[PDB]
Amino acid sequence: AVRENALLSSSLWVNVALAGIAILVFVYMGRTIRPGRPRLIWGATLMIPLVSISSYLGLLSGLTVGMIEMPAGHALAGEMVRSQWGRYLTWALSTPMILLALGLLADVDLGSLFTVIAADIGMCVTGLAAAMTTSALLFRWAFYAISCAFFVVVLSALVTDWAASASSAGTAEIFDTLRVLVVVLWLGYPIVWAVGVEGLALVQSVGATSWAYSVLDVFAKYVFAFILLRWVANNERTVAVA
Amino acid sequence: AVRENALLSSSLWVNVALAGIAILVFVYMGRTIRPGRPRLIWGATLMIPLVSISSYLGLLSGLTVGMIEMPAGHALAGEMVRSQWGRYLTWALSTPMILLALGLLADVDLGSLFTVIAADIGMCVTGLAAAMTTSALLFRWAFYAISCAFFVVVLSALVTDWAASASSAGTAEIFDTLRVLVVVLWLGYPIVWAVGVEGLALVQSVGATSWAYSVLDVFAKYVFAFILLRWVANNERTVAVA
Amino acid sequence: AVRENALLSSSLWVNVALAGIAILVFVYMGRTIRPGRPRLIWGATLMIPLVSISSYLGLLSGLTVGMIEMPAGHALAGEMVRSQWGRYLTWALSTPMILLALGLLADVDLGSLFTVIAADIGMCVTGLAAAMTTSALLFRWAFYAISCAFFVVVLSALVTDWAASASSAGTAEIFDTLRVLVVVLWLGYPIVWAVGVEGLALVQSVGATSWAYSVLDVFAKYVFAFILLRWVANNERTVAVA
Ligand SMILES: CCCCCCCCO[C@@H]1O[C@H](CO)[C@@H](O)[C@H](O)[C@H]1O
Ligand SMILES: CCCCCCCCO[C@@H]1O[C@H](CO)[C@@H](O)[C@H](O)[C@H]1O
Ligand SMILES: CCCCCCCCO[C@@H]1O[C@H](CO)[C@@H](O)[C@H](O)[C@H]1O
Ligand SMILES: CCCCCCCCCCCCCCCC(=O)O
Ligand SMILES: CCCCCCCCCCCCCCCC(=O)O
Ligand SMILES: CCCCCCCCCCCCCCCC(=O)O
Ligand SMILES: [Cl-]
Ligand SMILES: [Cl-]
Ligand SMILES: [Cl-]
Ligand SMILES: [Cl-]
Ligand SMILES: [Cl-]
Ligand SMILES: [Cl-]
Structure with a gap:
């Protein structure tokens, strides 16, 4: 929208850039990936930052952002x-x-x-x-x-x-590592919703709420994908033999 | 919406309660389910009443209900x-x-x-x-x-x-039983649509149309799930060995 | 909508008819299809024209058509x-x-x-x-x-x-043939979008843009399905043995 909030704007452009860098890094990392299980997981991994970029474009363009009136009882009831x-x-x-x-x-x-x-x-x-x-x-x-x-x-x-x-x-070694990341990081999303403007609004800033989700995405998506891909690239033997 | 129709309101709250009871009964029934095929089917089964509750919340809140103007020819054309x-x-x-x-x-x-x-x-x-x-x-x-x-x-x-x-x-024994329930009960939905206010409107009451779907859901979802789950819990042997 | 454009209207009705003819031809062609892999692919194939008919009904009825204002820079900016x-x-x-x-x-x-x-x-x-x-x-x-x-x-x-x-x-023989059709025909869709009114608008006619997509559908869906189904019906041996 007619957004002039730098806090909000920056939280979106930052991830368009990071997601773009991720895609390139991943395509590169898959240069010498053997066909079969490895190559496939590589494909599933490239899709993560691609979908993410699409998401941030929707928000930046205003296409997937809207104004919602809060109901009675909410900290911002009527707004x-x-x-x-x-x-x-x-x-x-x-x-x-x-x-x-x-x-x-x-x-x-x-x-x-x-x-x-x-x-x-x-x-x-x-x-x-x-x-x-x-x-x-x-x-x-x-x-x-x-x-x-x-x-x-x-x-x-x-x-x-x-x-x-x-x-x-x-x-099991790589799975246990990734499992910890998934559970800990995913618990972050419902906490942001609850603490942010849409839940309890303990933090009323939309820009701040947006930056919280953006930081989580960086780790839950980009860093997560990198760790997974890096292991596969160095263990194609155990992955493919499945 | 600004609904004051008890007939309509009751048809929705009734299933929020029944669906909630179903979830508890199912979680309980799965207490001693062996891992593998059994446990999985148990998971697929718990999802049925969970999705159902979400559906009735959407209707009760007004989020997924709307006003549609009927076209010329319809029994309620122009309304x-x-x-x-x-x-x-x-x-x-x-x-x-x-x-x-x-x-x-x-x-x-x-x-x-x-x-x-x-x-x-x-x-x-x-x-x-x-x-x-x-x-x-x-x-x-x-x-x-x-x-x-x-x-x-x-x-x-x-x-x-x-x-x-x-x-x-x-x-085959349990499947044949469930198959009859699925076919007979599923045929009920298109009949309600056709006879109700959105089809031919032989019955113009929205409250009545809503109760028809709610009763079908009780059997097609909750009773169906119970019968399936109860069999699996007592036949984990033949299910798991698959 | 209040469409009086014959060019536009005809591009939609033509495929409702062709898609309908396709369904009948396919159901017929599957008359003597052996159970297993063959029969299944036959099922997946019948779904193509069924979905297509649903799509053209949405457009003809106006349900899935809308007015979009083009942004600054576009050949039709402001319209x-x-x-x-x-x-x-x-x-x-x-x-x-x-x-x-x-x-x-x-x-x-x-x-x-x-x-x-x-x-x-x-x-x-x-x-x-x-x-x-x-x-x-x-x-x-x-x-x-x-x-x-x-x-x-x-x-x-x-x-x-x-x-x-x-x-x-x-x-491999039938796959290689179908692969060529898929790649060549699918490349047609992004070209129509780009050349048509929504992309560069080198062609500003909505009726013409619509006919381009309709012709592609005829080949990418109906003719494609026929070629695939005809091969399967004559090679149930190699398909089923999989
Ligand atoms: C599953 C967890 C459900 C938590 C339900 C919380 C309901 C309270 O809701 C909260 O009440 C506060 C005081 O009125 C308001 O200021 C907050 O904006 C509102 O979200
Ligand atoms: C697949 C089954 C298709 C049935 C098409 C039925 C078309 C008739 O439609 C019916 O006509 C009546 C008389 O005008 C109206 O009163 C009803 O409201 C209307 O639904
Ligand atoms: C991946 C391919 C991206 C192509 C981006 C093309 C951007 C140019 O966009 C084009 O500019 C023309 C001149 O202003 C206008 O007349 C066209 O309507 C507009 O679509
Ligand atoms: C692998 C199976 C996937 C099936 C996924 C079903 C649900 C898909 C929901 C897709 C929503 C896509 C919206 C993208 C919006 C945007 O970024 O602009
Ligand atoms: C197991 C594969 C599932 C793929 C399902 C694809 C289609 C999903 C459609 C989901 C609609 C969900 C809307 C819920 C609305 C509500 O209850 O409030
Ligand atoms: C085989 C898996 C399929 C999962 C498909 C998920 C996405 C489904 C999107 C369905 C859109 C249907 C809209 C039809 C509209 C119409 O023709 O009127
Ligand atoms: Cl995303
Ligand atoms: Cl925003
Ligand atoms: Cl439901
Ligand atoms: Cl309602
Ligand atoms: Cl289609
Ligand atoms: Cl149109």
Whole structure:
């Protein structure tokens, strides 16, 4: 929109640049990747920053940002707030690719991978619903709670059958490392929503709320992808033999 | 919306309660489920009532309900009618989870499961299109007819290759029982649409139309899930050995 | 809309008729298809014209067509143009079914098929974003470029691991033929977008732009499906034995 907020603007352009750099680094890193399992995981990995760039373009252009009036009870009840709904929306595409990458690395069951992606999509769409609901504060937090439930379904797989699959696939070392990053970093998103302007609004700055999500993306997406890709490039032997 | 219709309101809250009770019953029933195939189907099953609750929250909050003006020729031509479009929309997520549960139980081909889910999604989205179309009555019913065609694609699998897979997976008894429930109960949805306010409007009450869908959901989702889960919990032997 | 343009109208009705004829021809051609791989690919194939008909109904009814104001710099800057956004939207469902059909025929890896469909969906949604963006010309073309990148991900599979899979599946002859059709015909869509009213507008006619896409659909969907189905019906032996 007619945005003149440098704090807000910078939080978006910064990741267009970092995501672009990521794509180049990854394409390069895959220069000598053997066909099969390795090459595939490499493909799933390149998609992460590509989707991310698309997301930040939507926000920067104003296409996926809108004004939402907060309901009675909210700290900003009666006011219109800038909602970056494009973030929720695009996650529904980026979280599934992150999970496919991990699923392949761990060589998990097809039925398990499918159930997890379904739960992840549900988590993202109910989160969008929480942000878009304007009739009553009760419904906004009800969606947030249901979204949390789907999040638990996704996490349960990472702590159970996916870890067991990685152990039999010979990738337990890298999986355990990535699992910690996923759980810790993913817990950051619902905390930002809750503390930010759309939840409790303990922090009323939209620019600050935006920078919090942008920093998380840097680690949950770009650094995560790099660590995964770097391991695969140096362990094509154990990955391909699966 | 500014709804004061108790008939309409009650048809929604009733299922928020029943769906909530279902989730608890299911989590409990899965207390002693062995890892592998069983545990997975248990996961796919818990997702059904979770998605359902999300759907009823959307309707209750007014987020996924809207006013649609009926075209010339319609029994209510020129009037604005309350459309619970959130139902169509959410089915696109709930019907696929019901099918995954059945697909696993029957241990069907990956290519078959994928084709069926695609047809199911097409059925749900063209049904939404039928409800949202306002230019001419002809187009509303054209979408309804195409939606019926996708429904036939889904059903053809249940009467052919999915039954054959269940027979070789040792789950033909439970599959045949669930198949009857699915076909009979699913035929109920297009009949309600056709007889209700959005189709022919033989019944002009939006509250009554809503209660019809709510009753179907109780059986097609909650009772269906219970029957499936109860069998799996008592036959983990034949399910896991797949 | 209040369309009186015969050029535009005819480009839509023509394909409702051709798509309808296609469905009948295909159902018929599958009369004596043996169960298993063959029958499945037959199913994936019938879905193509079904989805296509749904798409043209959306456009004809006006449900998925809208007016978009072009930004400064555009050849039609400041004017409102008719956007057939329903095409982009529905492709997100039709391109994936075309790819499933090919994936089965070639008996490709599950992880590869999944990565490709994800990239295809990204291609379609960023293309929609390009069409819907109105704030600045820069963002419209930025989305177009990102969409092109996803297109490359999809194509890379057709020239690498999918061809290798078809060779080991004994379907390299038919795959190589279909691959040429897919690549050549798919390159046509971004060219029409670029040359048409939404891109550079070298051709400002919306009716002409619409006919270009309609002709491509005839070959990329109907003729493509026929060629694939006809081969399968005459080679059920090599297909099923997979
Ligand atoms: C699953 C977690 C659900 C938490 C529900 C929190 C409901 C409280 O909601 C909070 O109440 C405060 C005081 O009125 C307001 O200032 C905040 O803006 C509002 O979000
Ligand atoms: C696939 C089944 C298609 C059925 C198409 C039915 C078209 C008739 O449509 C019906 O006509 C009645 C009389 O004008 C009206 O009162 C109804 O509201 C209208 O839905
Ligand atoms: C990936 C390919 C990106 C191409 C970016 C093209 C940007 C130019 O954009 C073009 O500029 C012309 C002159 O101002 C206008 O007349 C056209 O309408 C406009 O689309
Ligand atoms: C690998 C399977 C993926 C299936 C994913 C289904 C859900 C896709 C949701 C896609 C939303 C895309 C919106 C992008 C918006 C933007 O960045 O401009
Ligand atoms: C297991 C694969 C699933 C892929 C599913 C693709 C289509 C998803 C459609 C999701 C619509 C979700 C809307 C929920 C709305 C609500 O309840 O508030
Ligand atoms: C086989 C997996 C498919 C998963 C597909 C996910 C994305 C589906 C997008 C569907 C858009 C449908 C809109 C149809 C509109 C119309 O024709 O009226
Ligand atoms: Cl993203
Ligand atoms: Cl913003
Ligand atoms: Cl539902
Ligand atoms: Cl309602
Ligand atoms: Cl289409
Ligand atoms: Cl048009």
